[PDB]
Design a protein around this ligand. Structure first.
Ligand SMILES: O=C(CO)[C@H](O)[C@H](O)CO
Lengths: 542, 541
């Protein structure tokens, strides 16, 4: 009579499933890779049928690993990348691809075929663009829809359903076509605060046809996370997954936002739900999303949103990011000529490259409180792939100072430390921007890459002057999705309730001394000056 | 603490297991592998697809174990006896009517080469005495004759011809060394003379395979547990998330890995396994029936005797049934009542086997009357031909006692008839071994069937032999891990790894004389069905 809940997370590379008990402890997990197709540059495609098979196999293996009965599984939640799934009028895969294969019916979030369409949309200056900083991205869905209407007219004539990936999953599981407020508000321009598609936008950009039949093709009904769909797991989906028909299924959510649910509510007050007002979520990895919520709407330069009820009801979401975080740290580490020799030594000692570099840093520092100061004369402007937040300029580039003609592991370690600090300083700039525009953030909840690196964590806390709180359960997106399942099943009455019950703080890392904090204040002055210097070089060259 | 990985690539999935030094599994994972069936009798796979599944399975299994890769000291690989074809650069080269190079593996169960096998058999070459007198189309030399005849463009561009398990070890280590198991069992290598027989390849139209010192098929051949290359290559280690140089054993065929994983368990009172009395029954999709002796026994319709194909200085007599798990699952899953029963099984927290076993129990009244439910329902189980001891790939299945009824009771009875038909086929093999040098009265059994109490008890009842079930039923994974311990130098020989890392967990014995006599009568019908089938064939000529 003990109950379990499953979260499913469909990432770029794999579909993953986790089985959780009622206190949020993971008792089972499994993974299946999903196939990627890259027919030409900027084109990145997947197959919805391949993904669904991956999800079903992952779920079956996780339940088996958990060693529980299917009647014990009482709720499912699904999250995925914000990719685009195209189906015909019968619900079957319909090609989006130069290959013509109907199997290739998913335009992956990271596909950039629709750059031209995004530029056309942006030129209209339509009001709904104000929620994406006035500049729609080619990754978002409406540019992609316009691209398909233009370049794949036969597909366009035969469309029955245009799903954000998370919504495809819940539809495939339940037959219910209802869409999530998350995908639709964040990525499709749905006005969460007016509960509607804006027909003026769709007409203006040349997508007027999507609104026919009560907007059947894109979402006639749109609901909050935690709401149960259809009559639960369909007979078909239950047989495919090895579960019980009717098992509750929540409305879907985008992957990063699931991560946020997974961690943002882990309470610092015994026997209360968490206070969100002063927290930011850092969803780390190769890139990082910076997510906070307010009771009021704030349009913040360089940050996306405000998106109403995109995660929690009666909260407006603001979302910033850094495009290369783990990716930048790995670029700096892996490009250094000492890398291969140090990697080999690390592997042989059963450590990660980060643990090996951290060891070097500790040795160079003498005592640990001196680690931050090792970069007193070495600075980095981290915008190697532009800056997303708060500068919103994809054309910015990186700078590194303090370079010497030395190629030792010590030099590599210093460059890695400078990278961590630059990224932490960029996080400080995002938090500061939010705090000048409606927030009072003083605490960071973190998940994903970097959270198992003690120097990464500590220097984020030092640079921002905010505590970094690390989760008991590392699997934030699977856990957040499972929490949605509990709400859909009625076990908890609200997401904040589920979050408080199913996540907790595993470790609190506070900023250190005033000396260390003041050092970062000076580093931050350099961080800002480097941007102005960059702009000055550009001016001089003109 | 030290750990060891077994990789087992079966018909449907690549699996990986992480074992401790006592042979307990501490992590596992699986990945499906793609099957292609261009037309009847043709069954193909992709080596690239297989390798990716293996790597992902290994990465996942280690992650589940939650150990550090530096802790993994040895790996062993086992696979089905499928044929992997690569070109001069080592890339997939098509074996398919589809002409797709991705389709470069002829799966063990493929029967495309029936006529080539017949032609080889008509030669009566001496090497045939070591496959029971009759080469199977499932074996590699018939398939190689088939490719040479049908696909000259492929044959022209061949660089490597690998039994799947040797493909795995080569991919992992860069060493092209072949295993004694794969070569002796499936390629006609003479384990007792340590060489290829040039007179066989000549006579059979494959002399060209022996060029450049047998480079295409294997110039160097070694026993299991020998370390290959200098352990994992940097690339394979990277691909699997392990440490370069980790020891990798010479490969082994899957059924043979299971034998290593179980046959050697000491008895419940301390005694050494006794190979005169104990056979390994290695279950799964298909089942192998493995007996070893210090002496050579030639047995018509049973593969072998194969010298040093599993243990050094032992001859292996290898029987088998080509469809066992596959047949049970075919009979269950093809029945119209399956989806409804599966749903009710899940509602009770049961497998489909437990749900059928319950129906049988209800229908019989008492548990001891279950066998008699098929008094008028009989099956000849040769759906994919018979491997042993008839050795005839042309044989087919028969089911009697059919009615219009489509109920869960009908489904359960047909499932029981299947189990019993497989048990009677096992009896036929065991009786044949006992006419040829053995005194088998016990089966050491592995595989999914062994978690089904009706499958286990009716095998014991039909054969008169005790069923011994191991503590770890994943015998193939465990045997491969054991080989990893030997390549790592942790145990000196396979027999000491076997006794340290496997143990008995259950002993199930035959039941009453009334039940035994019933199976004696069913066995008369089982034999009669074969003669009946041949008589239909005669009448149709
Ligand atoms: O590899 C296969 C398929 O599992 C068979 O087990 C061999 O034919 C046994 O020799």
């Amino acid at each position: 009579l003990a109950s379990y809940f499953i979260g499913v997370d469909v990432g770029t590379g794999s579909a993953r499933a986790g089985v959780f008990d009622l206190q949020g402890r993971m008792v089972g997990q499994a993974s299946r890779e999903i196939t990627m197709f890259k027919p030409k540059a900027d084109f990145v495609e997947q197959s919805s049928e391949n993904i669904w098979q991956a999800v079903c196999n992952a779920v079956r293996d996780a339940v088996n690993q958990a060693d529980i009965n299917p009647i014990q599984v009482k709720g499912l939640g699904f999250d995925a990348t914000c990719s685009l799934v195209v189906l015909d009028k019968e619900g079957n895969p319909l090609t989006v691809s130069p290959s013509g294969r109907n199997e290739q019916n998913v335009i992956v979030w990271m596909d950039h075929r629709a750059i031209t369409q995004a530029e056309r949309i942006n030129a209209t200056k339509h009001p709904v663009l104000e929620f994406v900083g006035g500049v729609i991205s080619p990754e978002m869905q409406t540019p992609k829809l316009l691209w398909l209407k233009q370049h794949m007219p036969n597909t366009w004539s035969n469309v029955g359903h245009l799903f954000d990936l998370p919504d495809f999953l819940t539809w495939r599981a339940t037959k219910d076509e209802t869409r999530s407020l998350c995908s639709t508000v964040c990525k499709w321009t749905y006005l969460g605060h007016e509960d509607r598609w804006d027909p003026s936008y769709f007409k203006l950009v040349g997508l007027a046809d999507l609104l026919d039949n009560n907007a059947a093709k894109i979402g006639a009904t749109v609901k909050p996370m935690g709401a149960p769909l259809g009559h639960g797991l369909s007979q078909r989906a239950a047989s495919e997954m090895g579960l019980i028909p009717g098992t509750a299924v929540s409305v879907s959510i985008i992957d990063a936002h699931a991560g946020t649910i997974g961690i943002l509510g882990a309470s610092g007050v015994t026997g209360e739900n968490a206070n969100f007002d002063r927290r930011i979520a850092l969803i780390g990895g190769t890139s990082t999303a910076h997510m906070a919520m307010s009771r009021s709407a704030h349009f913040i330069s360089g940050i996306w949103g405000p998106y109403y009820s995109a995660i929690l009801p009666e909260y407006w979401l603001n979302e910033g990011g850094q495009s290369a975080t783990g990716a930048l740290i790995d670029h700096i580490i892996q490009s250094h000529p000492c890398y291969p020799a140090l990697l080999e030594q690390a592997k042989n000692k059963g450590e990660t490259i980060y643990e090996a570099l951290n060891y070097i840093l500790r040795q160079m520092a003498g005592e640990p409180e001196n680690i931050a100061f090792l970069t007193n004369d070495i600075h980095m402007l981290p915008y190697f792939h532009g800056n997303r937040s708060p500068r919103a300029n994809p054309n910015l580039t990186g700078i590194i100072t303090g370079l010497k003609l030395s190629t030792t592991p010590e030099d590599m370690a210093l460059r890695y430390l400078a990278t961590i600090q630059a990224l932490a300083l960029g996080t400080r700039h995002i938090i500061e921007t939010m705090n000048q525009n409606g927030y009072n953030i003083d605490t960071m909840m973190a998940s994903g890459g970097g959270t198992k690196n003690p120097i990464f964590v500590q220097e984020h806390a030092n640079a921002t002057g905010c505590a970094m709180l690390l989760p008991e359960e590392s699997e934030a997106m699977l856990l957040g999705s499972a929490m949605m399942g509990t709400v859909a099943a009625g076990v908890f009455e609200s997401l904040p309730e589920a979050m408080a019950a199913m996540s907790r703080i595993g470790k609190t890392v506070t900023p250190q001394t005033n000396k260390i904090k003041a050092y970062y204040d000076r580093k931050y002055r350099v961080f800002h000056q480097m941007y102005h210097d960059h702009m000055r070089y550009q001016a001089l060259m003109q």
